[PDB]
Swiss-Prot record:
It is linked to Intellectual developmental disorder with language impairment and early-onset DOPA-responsive dystonia-parkinsonism: An autosomal dominant disorder characterized by global developmental delay affecting motor, cognitive, and speech domains apparent in early childhood or infancy. Most patients also show movement abnormalities, often hypotonia with later development of dopa-responsive dystonia or parkinsonism. About half of patients develop various types of seizures. It comes from Homo sapiens. Belongs to the nuclear hormone receptor family. NR4 subfamily. A motif (nuclear export sequence (NES2)) lies at residues 194-203. The ligand-binding domain (LBD) contains no cavity as a result of the tight packing of side chains from several bulky hydrophobic residues in the region normally occupied by ligands. NR4A2 lacks a 'classical' binding site for coactivators. This is Nuclear receptor subfamily 4 group A member 2. Transcriptional regulator which is important for the differentiation and maintenance of meso-diencephalic dopaminergic (mdDA) neurons during development. It is crucial for expression of a set of genes such as SLC6A3, SLC18A2, TH and DRD2 which are essential for development of mdDA neurons. It is found in: Cytoplasm; Nucleus. A motif (nuclear export sequence (NES1)) lies at residues 76-85. Residues 1-221 form the NR LBD domain. The chain holds residues 362 to 598 of 598 of the full protein. It comes from the Eukaryota. The gene is NR4A2. Expressed in a number of cell lines of T-cell, B-cell and fibroblast origin. Strong expression in brain tissue.
């Protein structure tokens, strides 16, 4: 019932099994509407799985529904990228998605554009730090459990955030490495802007219009 245990449990229960991965579409050197649609499908498919991870963070389910939505929606792309980066094999150009589908980076270029290159690069940096499951489960939680403008119960979010911070602190001790760990969180904000830049392009291009939920989330989150 420990907090770090519950966070690890949240992480483990919402990630695909390495023992049952889907290589049926994988192409190391591959030879467009359906690539863009794939990109959207990967985003939408990831949404329900991350929300399900969010709900397994202690205290998260206890917030007003408005606050849950605010936290989730604000951190979604940050979460998508982090979990992808941690799961994948950047040395081999392999991206492993939340449904267990394995695709080469080259297969992701048409849909994601320049963004998978940023993702794969980030995955390289993240993995070179050799962050254990416990520590990652903390960083993942902190990407979402953070103060946002428009929270009905910010002190509750603040309280939960610091509890996760101290979990990570205690686990690290089992000081230097902690700052570089928390330093991955502003780097995700940049990666999120980049996903947004990609959706922006695609929508402007208007070859495939984004599905309703992506569209709604994209439009609402723009501060202009
Ligand atoms: C990640 C980087 C961004 O550019 C946006 C930030 C936008 C507004 C600030 C929110 C913080 C607050 O509420 O105070 C975020 C991304 C948010 C996305 O996850 C929203 C979904 C995009 C549609 C797929
Ligand atoms: Mg507008």
């Amino acid at each position: 019932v420990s907090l770090i245990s519950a966070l690890v449990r949240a992480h483990v229960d919402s990630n695909p099994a390495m023992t049952s991965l889907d290589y049926s579409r994988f192409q190391a050197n591959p030879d467009d509407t359906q690539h863009i649609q794939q990109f959207y499908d990967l985003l939408t498919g990831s949404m329900e799985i991350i929300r399900g991870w969010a709900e397994k963070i202690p205290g998260f389910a206890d917030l007003p529904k408005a606050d849950q939505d605010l936290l989730f929606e604000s951190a979604f792309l940050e979460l998508f990228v982090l979990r992808l980066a941690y799961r994948s094999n950047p040395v081999e150009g392999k991206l492993i998605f939340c449904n267990g589908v394995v695709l080469h980076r080259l297969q992701c270029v048409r849909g994601f554009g320049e963004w998978i290159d940023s993702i794969v690069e980030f995955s390289s940096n993240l993995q070179n730090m050799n962050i254990d499951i416990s520590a990652f489960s903390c960083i993942a939680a902190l990407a979402m459990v953070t103060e946002r403008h428009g929270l009905k119960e910010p002190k509750r979010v603040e309280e939960l955030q610091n509890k996760i911070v101290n979990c990570l602190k205690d686990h690290v001790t089992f000081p230097n490495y902690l700052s570089k760990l928390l330093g991955k969180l502003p780097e995700l904000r940049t990666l999120c802007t980049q996903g947004l830049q990609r959706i922006f392009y695609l929508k402007l291009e208007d070859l495939v219009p984004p599905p309703a939920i992506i569209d709604k989330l994209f439009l609402d989150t723009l501060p202009f």
